[PDB]
Nucleic acid binder design. Structure first.
Ligand SMILES: [Cl-]
Ligand SMILES: [Cl-]
Ligand SMILES: [Cl-]
Ligand SMILES: [K+]
Ligand SMILES: [K+]
Ligand SMILES: [Mg+2]
Ligand SMILES: [Mg+2]
Ligand SMILES: [Mg+2]
Ligand SMILES: [Mg+2]
Ligand SMILES: [Mg+2]
Ligand SMILES: [Mg+2]
Ligand SMILES: [Mg+2]
Ligand SMILES: [Mg+2]
Ligand SMILES: [Mg+2]
Ligand SMILES: [Mg+2]
Ligand SMILES: [Mg+2]
Ligand SMILES: [Mg+2]
Ligand SMILES: [Mg+2]
Ligand SMILES: [Mg+2]
Ligand SMILES: [Mg+2]
Ligand SMILES: [Mg+2]
Ligand SMILES: [Mg+2]
Ligand SMILES: [Mg+2]
Ligand SMILES: [Mg+2]
Ligand SMILES: [Mg+2]
Ligand SMILES: [Mg+2]
Ligand SMILES: [Mg+2]
Ligand SMILES: [Mg+2]
Ligand SMILES: [Mg+2]
Ligand SMILES: [Mg+2]
Ligand SMILES: [Mg+2]
Ligand SMILES: [Mg+2]
Ligand SMILES: [Mg+2]
Ligand SMILES: [Mg+2]
Ligand SMILES: [Mg+2]
Ligand SMILES: [Mg+2]
Ligand SMILES: [Mg+2]
Ligand SMILES: [Mg+2]
Ligand SMILES: [Mg+2]
Ligand code: NA
Ligand code: NA
Ligand code: NA
Ligand code: NA
Ligand code: NA
Ligand code: NA
Ligand code: NA
Ligand code: NA
Ligand code: NA
Ligand code: NA
Ligand code: NA
Ligand code: NA
Ligand code: NA
Ligand code: NA
Ligand code: NA
Ligand code: NA
Ligand code: NA
Ligand SMILES: [Sr+2]
Ligand SMILES: [Sr+2]
Ligand SMILES: [Sr+2]
Ligand SMILES: [Sr+2]
Ligand SMILES: [Sr+2]
Ligand SMILES: [Sr+2]
Ligand SMILES: [Sr+2]
Ligand SMILES: [Sr+2]
Ligand SMILES: [Sr+2]
Ligand SMILES: [Sr+2]
Ligand SMILES: [Sr+2]
Ligand SMILES: [Sr+2]
Ligand SMILES: [Sr+2]
Ligand SMILES: [Sr+2]
Ligand SMILES: [Sr+2]
Ligand SMILES: [Sr+2]
Ligand SMILES: [Sr+2]
Ligand SMILES: [Sr+2]
Ligand SMILES: [Sr+2]
Ligand SMILES: [Sr+2]
Ligand SMILES: [Sr+2]
Ligand SMILES: [Sr+2]
Ligand SMILES: [Sr+2]
Ligand SMILES: [Sr+2]
Ligand SMILES: [Sr+2]
Ligand SMILES: [Sr+2]
Ligand SMILES: [Sr+2]
Ligand SMILES: [Sr+2]
Ligand SMILES: [Sr+2]
Ligand SMILES: [Sr+2]
Ligand SMILES: [Sr+2]
Ligand SMILES: [Sr+2]
Ligand SMILES: [Sr+2]
Ligand SMILES: [Sr+2]
Ligand SMILES: [Sr+2]
Ligand SMILES: [Sr+2]
Ligand SMILES: [Sr+2]
Ligand SMILES: [Sr+2]
Ligand SMILES: [Sr+2]
Ligand SMILES: [Sr+2]
Ligand SMILES: [Sr+2]
Ligand SMILES: [Sr+2]
Ligand SMILES: [Sr+2]
Ligand SMILES: [Sr+2]
Ligand SMILES: [Sr+2]
Ligand SMILES: [Sr+2]
Ligand SMILES: [Sr+2]
Lengths: 56, 237, 73
RNA sequence: CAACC
RNA sequence: ACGACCGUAUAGUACGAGAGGAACUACGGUUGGUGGCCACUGGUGUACCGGUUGUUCGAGAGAGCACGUGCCGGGUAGCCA
RNA sequence: CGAGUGGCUUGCUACCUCGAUGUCGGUUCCCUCCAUCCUGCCCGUGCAGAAGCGGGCAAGGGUGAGGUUGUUCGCCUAUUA
RNA sequence: GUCGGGUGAGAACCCCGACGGCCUAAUGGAUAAGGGUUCCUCAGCACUGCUGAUCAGCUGAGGGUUAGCCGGUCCUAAGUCAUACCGCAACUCGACUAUGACGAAAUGGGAAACGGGUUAAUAUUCCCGUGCCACUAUGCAGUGAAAGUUGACGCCCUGGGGUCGAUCACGCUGGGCAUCGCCCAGUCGAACCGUCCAACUCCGUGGAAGCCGUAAUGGCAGGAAGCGGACGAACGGCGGCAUAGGGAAACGUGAUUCAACCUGGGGCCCAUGAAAAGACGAGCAUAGUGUCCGUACCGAGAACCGACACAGGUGUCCAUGGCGGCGAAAGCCAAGGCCUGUCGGGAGCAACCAACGUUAGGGAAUUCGGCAAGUUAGUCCCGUACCUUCGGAAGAAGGGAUGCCUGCUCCGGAACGGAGCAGGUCGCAGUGACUCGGAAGCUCGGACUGUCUAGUAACAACAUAGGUGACCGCAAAUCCGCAAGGACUCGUACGGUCACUGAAUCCUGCCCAGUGCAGGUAUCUGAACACCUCGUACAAGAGGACGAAGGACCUGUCAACGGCGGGGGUCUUAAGGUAGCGUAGUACCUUGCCGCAUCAGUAGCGGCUUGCAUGAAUGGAUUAACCAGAGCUUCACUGUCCCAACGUUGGGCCCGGUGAACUGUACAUUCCAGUGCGGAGUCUGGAGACACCCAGGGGGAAGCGAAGACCCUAUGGAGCUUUACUGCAGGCUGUCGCUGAGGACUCUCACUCCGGGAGGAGGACACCGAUAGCCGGGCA
RNA sequence: GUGGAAGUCUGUUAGAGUUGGUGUCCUACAAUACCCUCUCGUGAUCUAUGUGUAGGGGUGAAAGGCCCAUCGAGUCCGGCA
């Protein structure tokens, strides 16, 4: 069984969903953690300086 | 390289854990205030998943229903005693001090009241040899003379299920089923059969450890493999 | 006996399985009464079909050499 | 003879 | 677009003590190659005719399906060796 | 011992190609060379004959089937001009 | 698909009928996930649709999903999170222990709904009829109430009860066919309420010394059979429900085999097959309440995932429709679905290609190799070798039979079950299609079933049972974490950790010098702190004394790394290759030599064997069974071959419509030679050459595709190794702090451990912090 | 005779897999597909959903296999021009 096309048919699991806090479809319904805003993981909003060029 | 299997074990991930949620009970001796006035009646004999041996369900006078580490020869209806003044018969528990020398015992405590630590496996037994007012000498299943507090409790007789080891598994499938009831990753791939990156013995055109197997006691995890601090090897001499 | 093993495993393995299971299934004298009606119920567990006496014993024999010793001393 | 020895 | 060989007559002759043993020439055939043709033999021939298994159309009659003929036997034309 | 020809082997060189000219053997299909194995015509012989042996002209045609081996080559078998 | 017709400006593909077909574990029915309006209606064809389109999953607009009893909701599973506590420089980080919560929509547990009618689209939701559950209120009854039971459970074999379905018999209703007299369909009717009870268990009677009983095991004076009794089942029978419903009508009755469902008996485990909420226990009347969320549609060769209307991938149940047969097999056919695995028209339709049928004679000559194809085939009877671990080998091999019809026998309660007999009879052929093994021998490997390189490797590689060695008495060995802490472990030597070999059988020689590990060690060497001398009004510093682990040194150890030669009738460096096997999957020499077999055998098998460079758990030898493993031989068979032919289906070719990509410095009708950076359509010399187009097989463009993966070069990269360099974890060991009292000792008060507690064990040690020496490819 | 064991046999039952054709395809139906043949199919079996293990880390009956077409160290962004 190839890792490509044939293995794509088995994908019918729902993981990332619309986040209650930020609105992005990044709330992982299994982990109950938003990969975009951090909801479920931290009170503070998910943020990182690497999301932009160092001097900007 | 990569961490060897022995190192993956320590993390205690599912693959290496024991099926605890399926285990029945911790067969520790009952805790008696004193007097020995505690007696119970064997209500049933059950299979202990964690030891491949039988265990006995006991109902005590004060209403306590508990599984117990059963010696050979215990059956339903039989009455058992646990205390300093318990009778000296198979299936009864009392401090070594009260036990007559030269009597096979099992589920011997390490420290008085700990519930039992020694001689708990199928068909084994410790042999109470010497008495005293300060120390009770016991011969453990491995042949080692152990000095114990006479206040250490123990059960008279040998553990049930002896001879379990006399029959061969015959097939992989039988080993398989037993392993599924233990905290062990099985089957076993030999170090010499792995790539260099995976084990000290891995690599090489043909299989062979590219080094002596007797490893030092001081070796770090990841390197302590093969024959650990062997005092000798082989069968010779 | 080991006949269910066919031509597999080799002499020894299925020779001992035969003996062990042979002695295992023989008629055993109940300790409670005395009738040869004890049968194995599982690993180390025996029961008499006559009086229903359920008790512990060896894994494949109702009594072991070491078990018989306890009685003595 | 189709690289390495 | 023809190459080569075998055989017979020449002749048990010429030659040679013997053993052995030719040629010119005239013939018949084979083989390899070449071009063409189907009266003959052979193949094919899901044109066609027949036999027959399972199933369906109630039976009979007559048919479908079973892979582009269910299977089997025979085989015209044509195409072929 | 001396003088050459070829460009089938091997060696040598590093000229061409590393933004790639697919690598042995076989197979299939076509053209060619002659230093000729057979076939045609000759010369000599330690050429009686038959047959050998050696040499000359000659490239029209032919040079096949098999056993081991991936083999090329080679060894082997029965045929063959 | 075809012929007619319908609609429309327009019809091969939108609709109707007829005829012809396709799908049967699916191409039918219900659904999970997932999608998200794709569902229904109307109006459209600019877009999407492999051609067209009046059609549509497309465009525009409207409409559509109704619940006390179907899910959710409730419970808890593996397990997750939150808070507290603790760690961490710190946190959104981290382990434990408490608490709380979360965690199951087909498919875990679970209070209660059936039948019919209705819409364009919903429907156990609406409507009609009937019924049920929970809670609450009122009334009567009731003092019981929590013990127990249930929820609640593995794998294999099997009896009994029993519905649907299917079939058989006969009756009734309707249909079909029309030489007969047959063939088809229907013949209905729920939940619920009531009632019946087999099995299991038990009780009374009884009184078996051999009887009772089973498919089988089994049962009994510790009381068998028989007789009677208590308890006690179905999603089942029976009555109601039902002058309900449904049907055009009739609106049956019996039987067999019996999925569902119910209830028992047996066997297996080095394997033991959830939990909790809830329910029962624990009556009845009447009334009230029963909110909230889901509900359409697809569920796939067009509604999901794969960029697509993709030949892929994707769970569940329909596993009992008819013939067939052992069958959930093939083949054919219903119910139901479809003609959308969606471009058509034309040419006896050429070459060539993909699938495939048939080939005389020869029969593996083909080829690396029988690759490909074929041969055999179902069932019954006879019969079956070497070898063997006594299981097997084995369906060995080899031989014979096989249909139909007529009348019967036997087994069984019987089957629309099975086993036979006699007579008759047809064909080339009776497992007639379909389904359906070719067989045998020798050798190598691995014992076996099992695993694997998703996407070039299925093997001899990995695993395995078996054998073996190593560590550890549990405050352990091994391992994870910076720490708090943790896996192993509800475990305790018959354990479990770390390694090696790899079933059985017969065996497993010699070597401890080097390396490794371990033990010992008079003496030697061996750091820091403290101590002492010199030095400094102090300090730096120099030296001394003491000396832990470690090393030197000694010993043990090879189923520890590994080794088992050259020379002579010892030497290096410990020993100097034993049993076996041997030209090997190891032998260069080598096509070794002899033999077998063949016309011929670098192959294969047997023997020999000085082994370039076999050999014993780096396991040796050997071996029945097994194998999509490697090699060889034989019988059978055949288009693999001699040597090719004819045929079939789909393309190819022509026509309508649709309509890409690769590639392109320029020029370009080339050919023979030469030249040139030595491999030119383009330079030179000649030769040839009127332009354009169709089909073809691919000689050339050192053809297209990919900045060669080989090789080298770069003071390039990465993975891996080690007695490379340098370091870093980690372990051992000394010292200082924690740390107290009286080179050996006692004590208790810190601290540690055990204990529910009292208290016990230990104890200034250990743990921990700091530092010093040793080891240290585990890691950088 | 009964009994019905087995990592037991046959088997396109379901289901799992993939020896050979070095067949078809190779601007594909498909960035791993199609056909025939073949292997397993009561167990170390297969399978759905839930759940856990995370990057020098997992997971690995060990092939450097696998960790979302990516693995001798994933992916993303940043360091970074
Ligand atoms: Cl074990
Ligand atoms: Cl639902
Ligand atoms: Cl029964
Ligand atoms: K190379
Ligand atoms: K090159
Ligand atoms: Mg316990
Ligand atoms: Mg496990
Ligand atoms: Mg192993
Ligand atoms: Mg490997
Ligand atoms: Mg390593
Ligand atoms: Mg090995
Ligand atoms: Mg050069
Ligand atoms: Mg090229
Ligand atoms: Mg010449
Ligand atoms: Mg010529
Ligand atoms: Mg509907
Ligand atoms: Mg389609
Ligand atoms: Mg023929
Ligand atoms: Mg040949
Ligand atoms: Mg074949
Ligand atoms: Mg009869
Ligand atoms: Mg060989
Ligand atoms: Mg194998
Ligand atoms: Mg592969
Ligand atoms: Mg395989
Ligand atoms: Mg082992
Ligand atoms: Mg063992
Ligand atoms: Mg072992
Ligand atoms: Mg192996
Ligand atoms: Mg030989
Ligand atoms: Mg040895
Ligand atoms: Mg080895
Ligand atoms: Mg380059
Ligand atoms: Mg390289
Ligand atoms: Mg490097
Ligand atoms: Mg504690
Ligand atoms: Mg390194
Ligand atoms: Mg899963
Ligand atoms: Mg490798
Ligand atoms: Na020359
Ligand atoms: Na070639
Ligand atoms: Na010539
Ligand atoms: Na040859
Ligand atoms: Na009833
Ligand atoms: Na049937
Ligand atoms: Na169409
Ligand atoms: Na198997
Ligand atoms: Na040594
Ligand atoms: Na050796
Ligand atoms: Na196999
Ligand atoms: Na053919
Ligand atoms: Na060309
Ligand atoms: Na690398
Ligand atoms: Na028997
Ligand atoms: Na395959
Ligand atoms: Na990484
Ligand atoms: Sr696939
Ligand atoms: Sr899925
Ligand atoms: Sr969180
Ligand atoms: Sr931030
Ligand atoms: Sr415990
Ligand atoms: Sr405890
Ligand atoms: Sr190695
Ligand atoms: Sr020895
Ligand atoms: Sr003549
Ligand atoms: Sr003569
Ligand atoms: Sr047909
Ligand atoms: Sr046939
Ligand atoms: Sr180039
Ligand atoms: Sr010449
Ligand atoms: Sr001549
Ligand atoms: Sr040769
Ligand atoms: Sr138009
Ligand atoms: Sr529609
Ligand atoms: Sr919940
Ligand atoms: Sr449920
Ligand atoms: Sr099951
Ligand atoms: Sr029955
Ligand atoms: Sr619906
Ligand atoms: Sr469906
Ligand atoms: Sr599909
Ligand atoms: Sr139909
Ligand atoms: Sr269309
Ligand atoms: Sr014919
Ligand atoms: Sr051959
Ligand atoms: Sr041949
Ligand atoms: Sr036969
Ligand atoms: Sr696989
Ligand atoms: Sr493969
Ligand atoms: Sr062995
Ligand atoms: Sr040594
Ligand atoms: Sr020898
Ligand atoms: Sr062997
Ligand atoms: Sr010119
Ligand atoms: Sr072409
Ligand atoms: Sr099997
Ligand atoms: Sr099978
Ligand atoms: Sr292949
Ligand atoms: Sr084929
Ligand atoms: Sr491909
Ligand atoms: Sr079966
Ligand atoms: Sr991948
Ligand atoms: Sr960057």
């Amino acid at each position: 069984t190839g890792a490509g096309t044939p293995s794509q048919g088995k994908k019918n699991t729902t993981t990332h969903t619309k986040c209650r806090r930020c609105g992005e479809k990044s709330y992982h319904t299994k982990k109950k953690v938003c990969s975009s805003c951090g909801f479920g993981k931290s009170a503070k909003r998910r943020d990182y300086e690497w999301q932009s060029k160092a001097g900007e | 390289g990569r961490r060897i299997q022995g190192q993956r074990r320590g993390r205690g991930t599912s693959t290496f854990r024991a099926p605890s949620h399926r285990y029945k009970a911790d067969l520790e001796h009952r805790k008696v205030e004193d007097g020995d006035v505690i007696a119970g009646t064997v209500v049933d004999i059950e299979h202990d998943p964690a030891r491949s041996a039988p265990v006995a369900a006991v109902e005590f006078e004060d209403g306590d229903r508990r599984l117990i580490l059963a010696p050979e020869g215990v059956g339903v209806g039989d009455e058992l005693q646990v205390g300093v003044s318990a009778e000296i018969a198979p299936g009864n528990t009392l401090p070594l001090a009260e036990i007559p020398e030269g009597v096979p015992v099992c589920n011997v405590e390490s420290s008085p009241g700990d519930g039992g630590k020694f001689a708990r496996a199928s068909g084994v037994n410790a042999q109470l040899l010497t008495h005293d007012r300060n120390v009770a000498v016991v011969k453990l299943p491995s042949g080692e003379m152990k000095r114990l507090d006479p206040q250490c409790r123990a059960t008279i007789g040998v553990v049930a299920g002896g001879g379990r080891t006399d029959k061969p598994f015959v097939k992989a499938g039988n080993k398989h089923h037993k392993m599924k009831a233990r905290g062990t990753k099985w089957p076993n791939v030999r170090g010499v059969a792995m790539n260099a990156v995976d084990h000290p013995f891995g690599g090489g055109g043909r299989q062979h450890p590219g080094k002596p197997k007797s490893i030092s006691r001081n070796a770090p995890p990841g390197r302590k493999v093969g024959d650990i601090a062997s005092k000798r090897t082989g069968r010779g001499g | 006996r080991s006949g269910r093993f066919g031509a597999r495993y080799g002499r020894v393995s299925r020779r001992r399985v035969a003996e062990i299971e042979s002695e295992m299934n023989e008629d055993h004298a109940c300790p409670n009464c005395g009738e040869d009606r004890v049968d194995r119920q599982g690993t180390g567990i025996w029961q008499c079909s006559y009086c229903d006496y359920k008790f512990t014993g060896g894994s494949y024999k109702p009594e072991t050499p070491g078990g018989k010793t306890v009685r003595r001393s």
